[PDB]
Ligand binder design. Structure first.
Ligand code: NA
Length: 461
């Protein structure tokens, strides 16, 4: 991805977009009961903690576009992946407006708490004013589609979340690039059934984990993986994607019966954004918050890994490449050992910056003991080995519990963390609960005990 130009929005007929500047994150009642070093991300140019220009830092993710056309290895990757998706008999018909707005089997209703995007954010009109969960009314939406059309600018917001000390100082805040409600609706109508098929089929056929339930999915992954695992991290995946990867994605869509609306992908590839009082044009780079972001990043990841394998290992049998992606995150396997370092080398030529799995210093062999997916390790249950625990290290949970965005959601927030933590074992879980209960706020929470969560887990399969 590369920003073509940036200029005052007024110069191109757009209003100034008001974006938050004060974090809603504040120390929680557990701030001093648990250790952590993360703080709220810099949200404004004048944040005192900044040690470098903010604007420059947030847009530096756009490292450029390394490739223009779809080469022969990519075309082969496209054919193999598309052929694989064909086996799912994905319903290629457009999804009706109602289901696209309020959901259906395999697709949850539009989130009413997220931005409505342009021009609604500028007209002070909320989603709640347009959608009605109880009525499933499409009349108001339909008039808006007719009035403002599609392919509207994407509104950019700095994401309010916790970040490392370094990322705070370097102004490395992440951005929310929200599509207009009109575009979310149009894209969900165009690809609604594709989204549903993926959500209902997490695994090695879709090559996607989007919509998965880790508590149940983890026991299914090993049987899907090959004999040899391999993985690696991407540096700024979304923003590094070159236009050619979007074209390759369109080829897949065409081959599986959606050639009908590949135009929507152009809207993702060549897009314009509004940030504060500026407007800018980007070539390449996947927008962080459009409907289908994680699904398309996942599809593209399937194309990337297949491409690098073909380019690096001629004669590779893609029918034995078993991988599952969640955006840029991936867990992959092959009957034979492969060199991630070589794949990373080949990756640079395609505009991808690949590094050792989980921040490792060197490319090491990935095993069932050290592999992670969605930050979770895999650990067989002690009593029933066939049941696999998704294990997120307590470090992440501790970092998260030390802050709150709304005192009213304290119990939901803490319970959510408990659902993640108990997998670390009864001893650790109890220590976690004891610390929570070392302060008044924690003592007033209704939290599940270990045996309750274990029983509930067994009863969920
Ligand atoms: Na883009």
């Amino acid at each position: 991805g590369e920003i073509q130009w940036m200029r005052p929005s007024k110069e191109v007929g757009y209003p100034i977009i008001n974006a938050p500047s004060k974090t809603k994150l504040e120390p929680s009642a557990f701030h001093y009961v648990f250790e952590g070093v993360k703080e709220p991300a810099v949200l404004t140019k004048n944040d005192p903690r900044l040690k470098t220009d903010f604007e420059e830092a947030i847009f530096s993710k756009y490292v450029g576009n390394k490739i223009t056309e779809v080469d022969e290895y990519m075309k082969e990757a496209v054919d193999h992946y598309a052929g694989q998706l064909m086996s799912l008999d994905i319903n290629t018909e457009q999804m009706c407006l109602e289901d696209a707005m309020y959901g259906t089997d395999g697709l949850e209703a539009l989130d009413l708490s997220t931005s409505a995007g342009y021009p609604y954010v500028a007209m002070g009109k909320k989603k709640r004013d347009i959608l009605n969960k109880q009525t499933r009314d499409t009349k108001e939406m339909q008039k808006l589609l007719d009035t403002y059309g599609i392919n509207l600018p994407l509104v950019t917001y700095v994401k309010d979340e916790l970040r490392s000390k370094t990322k705070v100082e370097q102004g490395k805040s992440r951005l929310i690039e929200a599509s207009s409600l009109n575009d979310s609706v149009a894209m969900r109508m165009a690809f609604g059934n594709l989204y549903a098929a993926f959500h209902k089929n997490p695994g090695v056929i879709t090559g996607s984990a989007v919509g998965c339930d880790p508590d149940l999915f983890w026991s299914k992954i090993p049987v899907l993986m090959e004999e040899k695992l391999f993985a690696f991290d991407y540096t700024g995946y979304d923003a590094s994607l070159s236009p050619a990867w979007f074209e390759a994605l369109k080829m897949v869509l065409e081959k599986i019966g959606f050639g009908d609306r590949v135009d929507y992908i152009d809207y993702l590839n060549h897009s314009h954004h509004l940030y504060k009082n500026k407007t800018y044009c980007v070539k390449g780079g996947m927008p962080s918050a459009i409907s289908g972001t994680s699904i398309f990043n996942s599809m593209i990841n399937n194309l990337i890994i297949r491409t690098l394998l073909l380019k690096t290992y001629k004669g590779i049998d893609l029918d034995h490449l078993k991988m599952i992606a969640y955006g840029d995150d991936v867990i992959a396997s092959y009957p034979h050992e492969v060199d991630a370092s070589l794949l990373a080398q080949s990756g640079k030529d395609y505009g991808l910056t690949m590094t050792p799995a989980d921040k490792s210093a060197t490319f090491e062999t990935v095993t069932w003991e050290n592999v992670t997916f969605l930050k979770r390790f895999f650990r067989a249950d002690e009593k029933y080995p066939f049941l696999i625990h998704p294990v997120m290290p307590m470090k992440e949970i501790h970092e998260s519990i030390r802050w709150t965005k709304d005192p009213r959601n304290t119990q939901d927030h803490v319970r959510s963390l408990c659902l993640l933590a108990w997998h670390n074992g009864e001893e650790e879980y109890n220590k976690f609960l004891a610390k929570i209960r070392s302060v008044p706020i924690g003592r007033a929470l209704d939290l599940p005990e270990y045996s309750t969560l274990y029983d509930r887990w067994l009863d969920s399969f």
